[PDB]
Structure formats: structure tokens, C-alpha cells
Design a protein around this nucleic acid. Structure first.
Lengths: 275, 46
RNA sequence: GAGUGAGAAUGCAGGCAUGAGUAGCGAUUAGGCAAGUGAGAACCUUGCCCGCCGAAAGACCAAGGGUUCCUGGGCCAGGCCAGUCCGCCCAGGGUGAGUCGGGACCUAAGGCGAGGCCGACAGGCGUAGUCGAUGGACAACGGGUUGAUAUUCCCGUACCCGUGUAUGUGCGUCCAUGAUGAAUCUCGUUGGUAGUAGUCAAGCGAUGGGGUGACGCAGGAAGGUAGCCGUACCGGUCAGUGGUAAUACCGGGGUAAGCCUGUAGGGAGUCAGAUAGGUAAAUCCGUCUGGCAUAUAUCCUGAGAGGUGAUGCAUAGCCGAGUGAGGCGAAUUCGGUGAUCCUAUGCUGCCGAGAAAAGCCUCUAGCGAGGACAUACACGGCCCGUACCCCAAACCAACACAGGUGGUCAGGUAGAGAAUACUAAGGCGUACGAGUGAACUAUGGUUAAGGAACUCGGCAAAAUGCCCCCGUAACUUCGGGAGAAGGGGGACCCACAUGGCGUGUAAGCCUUUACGGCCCAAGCGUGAGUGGGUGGCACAAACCAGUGAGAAGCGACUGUUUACUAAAAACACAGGUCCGUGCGAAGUCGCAAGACGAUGUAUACGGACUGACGCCUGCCCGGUAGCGAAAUUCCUUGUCGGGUAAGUUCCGACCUGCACGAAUGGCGUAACGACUUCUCAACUGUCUCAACCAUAGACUCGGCGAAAUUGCACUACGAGUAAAGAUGCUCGUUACGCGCGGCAGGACGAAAAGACCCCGGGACCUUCACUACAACUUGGUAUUGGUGC
RNA sequence: UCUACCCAUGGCCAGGGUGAAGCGCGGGUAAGACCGCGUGGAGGCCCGAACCCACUUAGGUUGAAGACUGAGGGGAUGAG
RNA sequence: CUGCUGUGAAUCUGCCGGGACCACCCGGUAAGCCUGAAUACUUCCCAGUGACCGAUAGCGGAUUAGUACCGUGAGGGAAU
């Protein structure tokens, strides 16, 4: 849910926070926690390769089970649902009956004590993870793999999900959270259900302080920058650049995807751009 | 005021930024050491 | 044969002048006297007195410095003066660690990285590793001592690994000593070999694994302790004053780690069976399955109190051995107050969700007929730093420089306080002085009568200022505005008051007999109220300490910004929209590998632009077609008023005609603002209009002692003339020579080879200027087989 | 070693104030939004030191200082 | 003559050069080839020379000289 702050301060006026109502613990699993230090958006060269990144609250990585293949036929119980700093959705600490503990992206509607199944024989219920070959068509899945055994990569953000439109041969058509139609091998695994925490997109962060906590540094506009700094830089007043939009490196707006990619043949219908 | 001068001494940092090991690390620094040795510097480096 | 001739190059070097015996002699504390030393003393020593700091200007750590430390000498350099002195000069001495801070122990960011991958070469990355504290682990505290070191040395008492001895053999051996199924008949059983043979049984025992071991921010409350204030008691003073002989006053009224105990607080179910999930194995962890109680039970952790340590140590004081080194040495009780410290990595809340090594179990394995375990003896178990300075004269600042420099401790009285004032300890008077009522400058102070009339502008100053009672508007996003505004009181003494409150002596409560609870005389602290009275001009009497109100614009807001003239309306921002990106994504850094993005995945990332929040559709949004209302102020809108006596900013109606500018970029918008502008109340030396006082300069004397500038010089004025603005030229006028203190009209004064303007060149920026290059398609190379065609 | 930004690991922020949800209710109420009294202690919250800054003014301007001082001023639990 | 890219020759009736080609011709026998001494320079050492300098010259350096000093550093760099 969402808890809206009262306007006791100018920085809290329209602000809201996650109503952490699905969270069952305030701490992670110490065995599954890993160190995670900030980068500032800087690569191995020390250069800022991604701007507007830095500061931000310290985070600890929770090892997520995106490649859910080892526990094939071994059931788990939803031990807890926990906050994860490193993703918009909540994580679900599972207790595999064999005695192993792992984190997964907490799907929508998952509660503590629920039983989760993995493998072809798993029931089609939220949290269960079985290959697309065994997931029936016209169902809402998430945490879908791109290649068999490669680990979940698609629709793992809070509230997102993929529609398994159909299966033909050794491929399955998926409608992505972006509306794109893409084929992926049926041997790719996917967890059933949506991703939980769907309301998090409605969080109003209220003040610059919240985004500085989240690690987002302020964004300066090119039309404000000088001509040397940005192509939009200059003009007596906040211009629009004197021309159509371009990036700080001069790249104009337009499809930036590289052609001749091997996935061009897998992608059926790309996303609908403002229709 | 803000009367901080440019030079803030630090022996460890001096050694780690201009020291003999750092100079010998790169060919350019080795070149600097050799050039100082040819010039006759008593202090080839920090 | 020339390195052959200088006066110019804002030339170069060295030595000097001119200003000049001139400025200055470096804060906002302050010195004085007596004596000493000495050739010489404002400055050094000693004794007083005075003054300054006292959340430091006291005492330490760290960095940095590097001997500056101590002793003895020196005084021609330095010290802004002098100097006998010194951080200066010279010699000698001085730095003592199992425990402190580091290494020998860990790792974070990051560095380097065997191989390796990538790259024409150079090299770029990077795995394994290995470094890398600012963090983790890790054993010591009091007292004394030196001229200089001290958790280091010494004293006392503590805590971390080994060798020779003794206590037990806690179990097993060459035997015996327990557990296990050891076996026959589309299977069967016990009917043998065969409960023998093997395994575990010992005593111990990872580098290897496997698992616990491990962190945020805020907020109290409680219990303590340090500290502080008293007090029993103890030891002393009479400080030439009116009183004051113990009733008064002054000093003490101390003592650590360790060890013992285990209190307040905090956290905890426990015992079996199974299990490969933790790569193998585990008895460990995890999961599941059960049994029992969830209790004033038990177990961990744990401030503190108490005991010991402590018959020691230390201490007020005592006498005299002034080499002043010595000895002797009392009391030490209770209370109040009380931490920013401890319990506490606790507890509670919250979202922004908070870094491995040792430690402890487990096992595979291992030594081993014993070897090993614990206990008690006597004996042993590294390197580096350690002086000294460390808000400073020893560091960064060229200087003994008004600047900067992280952390720790944080007495008293007022006080909310770490503000502020004054003070304790402690440390200083800090390095030019003495004088002198000049102007003038600066910093303070006061000011009649006015009270913003000053001025671009209330700049500056002045003013409000605190606590408690009341009481608080428009508007609002319902949070605010707000401490709105406005009003009253505040001191001291007495009584209520042997009060109320907080603490807590005993007796009893139950009793588990406790480090127990409740109450509680007394004692000690202590708020506020009421009623009287007292004094003054004044009771937040000092210091400290909001001015407030109304408006207009801009920007929602807190925040950021041109280090060094711009802090803003600019940037940012939360919200919004658009575009890109289906994932070693896009986008960036790279030749590439690779990296960030992100250990993220369209509720996510990047980019662009807006910049909270609210509003912005008219016949058909089937037609002229984007609407014609309104909030829309260029408005020059005049007209009128409001506001001033004259009133800018601005506020209103009437205004303005296809208008005009915003179907999303224009209008509003509470709050906020060192933003811009204005009007008020108050206030004032801003002003009418200035006067006086003090201090630092200025001035005088003594010492030291520059500077920019300088073609010259016994350098007037007038009217002229001149490169058109003359001390230097003309004709006259004036003027004895030389200073000193002032003023700033000229010397087209100094300063900077004008930034303006032009010309020549440059640089950087823009682009549909030219030409190139980085960044994508075509042909064939890599690469290529048939058939259905 | 200045400075801009970022990363790791530490530290600091005197004092005072205001008072953001769940308990019990008078309630509102069929029931709810929600008013009030207590508790709680949030906030790029308020006043205000240290600390950081640098708005105004005066002085400095061959300075004490190649950017400072005095007096005021801003932030002062945070984007510190 | 030669780099890269593609395509790609026989054996002397061959192939290459003579700044196309019949060739009159001439010269030579690449790619698989490989391999020698006899000319430039002076850190350093020895002996010398100068119509070279002679302490602001001559080396930056006759002297503590790449020292003092300056700079974080590369580096700059004296005077005597």
C-alpha cells in the first residue's frame, strides 16, 4: 500500500511512502546478504559513465534466486517477505523443504507460509516457477528467462508482468511489460504471477532529499548548460536548444537499437510508442 | 575564514603519489627517474 | 682576426642613492613596583601587586615539523627595538613497552596484479592472489621517580604462549573390557561358514572445508556512575578596620586495573526422530516431524552497589637539614545534585533498509598403545614510534603572519545552555616603548528639540529582544501564517510553609530471608501560587537576547552557484510530459577487451524539456476549423480616484475591438526568501547640525627602519605662446633661506606597454562557411553443401 | 595534498521549542471520513551555540592577511 | 621498390628489367634462400692543441652545484 505523508513540512506535502504492509521482517537473511558498495555511476576507468548517480544510502545485496533450476520438485514455504533496497519489488525468503533458504522476487498476492513449487510438475499459482513448456498459454508470469538456464531477466520490476500469449514449436510468444511481443525458447523458466509491490510507482518522493537518499544526483538541463558543455547550451534564456532534442554528446532523438542483432528475429512486434 | 593553503603535507600521500615505487611503476616515471639521475639530482623522487 | 666601442631596449646583473631617518614596528589583555644579575635591563630572573583567557589564550591525541626537548655555555647574525633572554648559536645529554599506536593479525574503497583477455608497438583491463585503515580482533591499571622518558623506568597489584617437575589414566592397549545386520533355498529362513572376522571404544585432533560469529538513522524513558555542591569528622586563621575566639572563616573530608559477587536493564524455549539442502562427510547449521512448559523456571549478557586490591599508595597539615632535601602525617562519614559518560551493538520507532578475520561447533581427516587432557609448582615468550611543539612563534601560511588545522577532557556562580559575564585549576601580559586633551582617520560611548526632513536606498546606527500569564488577523495546501499582532506581571523580605514536590533514617511487609519491595520521621535539595510589606528612576536592572505590520513582482518550498566584485529572479529540486532501451539493453568511458548502467530488467534505466499545488472543451470538437469566456496585463488607460502637502512601487472601477497572449504555457497560489520594490508603527546623530569623552593611529622623544617613484632642479603666479591645457618659453606680478604639522588643486601625479575604439594576430564558441576526420549502408574475404526452388 | 564530484571507513552537531499514526473513550457514528483529551516523538521542522557558509556594512586596500578583521547575517538532523 | 585487401602464373620456347607492346634486341635469373671485413658516433680513459673564455666570461656549476633555494610534482635553479 501507500501511506501519504501529512504536509507538516514543505518537503512532505504531497509526499508518500510505501506502506510496508507485505513486509514480514525488518532484516534480511545474513547468509544470503552480500556486500554492495556504491559506484557513483563511474566505470573501471573512474570516469562518470552514468551521470546523476552517487551519494545514496548504503545498501546490502540480497542474493536472489533468478536461476531457479536446482530445486526442481523441492517445495518451499514462504518464510518471510522483506524489503529489498536493490529493487522496487519486495523479496520473498523461501524455506525449501530440503533445508535451503533463498530469495525470490515476491509476486503479487504472495503471503507468508505459502507453498512454492519449482519444475514442470509445479502448479500454476503465483510464485511457482516452471518452464514455459509447462506454463499454459494466456497466463500472467514474471521473472522470465531469455535463454534456457540464463536466469530471470524479464519483468522483475514491481507490479510488472508478462502475458504468455502462446507457444509454437520450441518458442513461446510473450507480451512484455512494455507491450512488445517477443519469442523466447520454451525451455526458459518463468515464475507464475505478477510482481508484487505494484503500488510503489505511486510513491511521491516529496523532496530532493528522498532522491538523494535513493542515490539520484541532480540533473542539470542542457539549455542551461553552456554551448561548450551541451549542444542545447546557450541562448538568452532557457531555450529548447535551437533545434530538436539531442543528448549531451550530440545524438538526436530516434531509435538507438543496433540493427542486425540476433534477437531481431525473436522479437515479433516491438513496443507501441505513444499510439 | 577559509585560509586553507594549497599544500597540506602528508608523508604517506607524498610517497604514494610521487614516490620511488610509483615512479618506477610506469615507463614515464622510470624515464623521469633516469632523467633526474642523469641531471645529477640527489633526490631522484619523493 | 674581431665576442672592437651603449645612454637608452618599462634591457640583464652587482653596488648604491630618492622618498627618509620617513611609513611601519602585526590586534581587539596591561602592565607596575622592589630586589637580583649584568658592561649594558621597559623587555631576563625572583617576590609581590594588577590585568587577560578560562568550551581556552587550560590539559592531551593525530597530522605535520625534526631535536626546536633538557643541562651548561654565547650574545656582532635572527627576534620588527634592546636583550644578560630566546623556538636563535655551540657542546653534551635526553625518547626504555609482551599490554599504549602500528607491523608480525584481518580485511573496505582503491592500488598492483602470476597466468590471462584485449591492443600494430607503447600499453588497457583483469582472475587467482597480494597489499591497502580512516574500520574489526587483540593482554594493565594506580602511585612514585628524572634536568630532560614513562600505561615503557621503579613500587604495588594485574592480565596474554613455552620448558623440567608432581596430582590424578578422565578411556584404550598384545589380552579382556560396549554398539552394530554379518549372511543359503518369482522372494522367504536363520538351518551352518558368521554375533567370529571388521568398524567404531582410546587420549586427544584444521591450513581443508560446512555453519553461527556481523554493523543504519532518530527518540526517549529508567537505572547508574564520573563530576559537582554541602555535611559528620579532622587540621588550622585571627588576615593591625565597627563586630568577629569558634558560633566565624580557611584547608582536607582521597586511592585504579585486576579478582570476588552477579544487582538494575536487555536477550533467550528446550529435548528427541528424520533429512543430504550447506559441493564430500557431519552429531554442526538449516528444514520438517513430534514430546514437555511457556513459569515470580533456567541460561547468557550486564551498568553499577558492595568486598578485596589497600596494614600499601596518596593527601590537608606538621617541624625544621634552604643542597631544601628530608622525614612525620589526622579525618575520610553521610546526603543533595548530576552528565553529552555507562547499561546500550540495549530498547522503541522509522525507511532511505544499513563493509570480513578471529571466536565457537561440525566433520571428514590426523598422531597414536598409549599419547594426550586438566590442575599445581619452578623457571623463559619480537620490530617500529615514544623527546619536544601541536588553534601554534616549532604544522599549512615566503614572516616569531589578526588567516587555516581533525579528535579528547569540559570545575564554580548566574544561565536552558558547550551562549554570555565573572571566576577555580592551569596558562598568559605575545617581543618596540615612553609621552601627549592638535587636526584628521578608525573603533567604541553620550546627546537638547525634531525624528528619515538623510540617501539611489532607513546604508549605518537606533530599536524589539528573556520567562510566565493572557490574547492573536487576512489568507491557507488545514500543516500553517504564529513568537502574528496586542496586553499584564517579573526585584527583595515576611506568612501561608514543620506547606506541596523530589529524594530518600528507622520500624514494620511479605517473607524466597534478599544486592528485595511499599511507606517514611529526619536531613538535603526545590518549583510555582496567593496575601501582605520593603527600595529605587529603573526588578528579563549587567552580559545575553525576534523589530513588527501591510503590499507588489520573482522563484513553490529546504538546498546549490561565479574560491577572489554577481547568492539572485540564476542552478537544483519534488511532480509532469516526450523520446530511447527486451538486456554483456539503450546511453556513456575505451582502439579493443572490458567497465558503469546494474549484481538493476518498461512500476527499470538513459536522455530531453518543464519545474510543487490548482484552473484552463466553445452547437457538431457529424464541420470551417479551434471559438469569440475568463484571471490578461504591453495597457503608453489616458478619465477618475486611494495612498503624499507634494506618492514612486502599487491598488481599484471606467478603460480600451475583429486582438492577442497563454486549448498547455499562461494565470492564480498558503508557506518559504540575507531576492527586487514600496507604505506604515517604533526607533533613532541618516539628517536639521553638529558637540563632547575615551581608545588605536596621527603628533613629540628614544631604538630599529622600508616602499612605490625618480631625466634633471636654488621646481612661483598671471595673461599669453607652444604638439592647441607650461614650475622650465614670452612679457610682467609676486616671492628673504630652511624646516615642521596639515589639505589634496596641479605636477595631463603613481600604479597596470588602455580592458573601450580601430588595425594585425590569437584563442575559444556557433553554423544550412570550406575542407577533413571520428561515428553507418553496398561488393566481394572470412564463406559455404545440395536439394524443394 | 587546493578545488569539483564520487567511493570506503570514522567522527561531530550545546541548549530550547513545536508536536506527524496506533490505544481508551465524549464522540462522530448502522458503519465510516474525522473533532478533542492522553501517549509517541516525525520532520531536507522552528529558535539558537560549536561547526559550515558568506547577505550587509565599516575597516583593510605598499593590509595583520596575494581575499582578511569587527559588527551584524544564513544553515545549524541534513541534499548537513 | 613497397604495405594491406582480393584474385592468382612452370621449370628456360620459363620469368623479370630497360619508365606500354610484335618483338630487332640487350641485361639479369626474384620469389625457399641465407651469409663477410673495410664507413658514422664518444658516456668513459690517455696524451695533446687553441690569433678560445678568464670569475656578470667560460659548462648551470673555478666556490655546498644540479648544491642552496623554489615547486605537490614533472621540473626550474643560483650566488660565492
Amino acid at each position: 500500500g501507500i501511506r501519504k505523508y501529512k504536509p507538516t513540512t514543505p518537503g512532505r506535502r504531497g509526499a508518500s511512502v510505501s506502506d510496508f504492509a507485505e513486509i514480514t521482517r525488518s532484516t534480511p537473511e545474513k547468509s544470503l546478504v552480500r556486500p554492495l558498495h556504491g559506484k557513483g555511476g563511474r566505470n573501471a576507468h573512474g570516469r562518470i559513465t552514468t551521470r546523476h548517480k552517487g551519494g545514496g544510502h548504503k545498501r546490502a545485496y540480497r542474493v536472489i534466486d533468478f536461476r531457479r533450476h536446482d530445486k526442481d520438485g523441492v517445495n518451499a514455504k514462504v518464510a518471510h517477505i522483506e524489503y529489498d533496497p536493490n529493487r522496487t519489488a519486495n523479496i520473498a525468503l523461501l524455506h525449501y523443504l530440503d533445508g535451503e533458504k533463498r530469495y525470490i522476487i515476491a509476486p503479487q498476492g504472495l503471503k507468508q507460509g505459502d507453498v512454492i513449487e519449482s519444475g514442470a510438475n509445479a502448479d500454476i499459482k503465483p510464485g511457482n516457477n516452471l518452464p514455459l513448456r509447462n506454463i499454459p498459454a494466456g497466463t500472467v508470469i514474471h521473472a522470465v528467462e531469455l535463454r534456457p538456464g540464463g536466469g530471470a531477466k524479464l519483468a522483475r520490476s514491481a507490479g510488472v508482468s508478462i502475458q504468455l500469449l502462446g507457444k509454437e514449436g520450441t518458442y513461446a510468444a510473450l507480451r512484455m511489460p512494455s507491450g512488445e511481443i517477443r519469442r523466447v525458447d520454451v525451455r526458459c523458466r518463468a515464475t507464475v504471477g505478477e510482481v508484487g509491490n505494484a503500488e510503489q510507482s505511486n510513491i511521491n518522493w516529496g523532496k530532493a532529499g528522498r532522491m538523494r537518499w535513493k542515490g539520484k544526483r541532480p540533473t542539470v538541463r542542457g539549455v542551461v548548460m553552456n554551448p561548450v558543455d551541451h549542444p542545447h547550451g546557450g541562448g538568452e534564456g532557457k531555450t529548447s536548444g535551437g533545434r530538436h532534442p539531442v543528448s549531451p554528446w550530440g545524438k538526436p532523438e530516434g531509435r538507438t537499437r543496433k540493427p542486425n542483432k540476433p534477437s531481431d528475429k525473436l522479437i515479433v512486434r516491438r513496443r507501441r510508442t505513444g499510439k | 575564514a577559509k585560509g586553507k593553503r594549497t599544500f597540506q603535507p602528508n608523508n604517506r600521500r607524498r610517497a604514494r603519489v610521487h614516490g620511488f615505487r610509483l615512479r618506477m611503476r610506469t615507463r614515464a616515471g622510470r624515464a623521469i627517474v633516469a632523467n633526474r639521475r642523469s641531471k645529477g639530482r640527489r633526490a631522484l623522487t619523493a
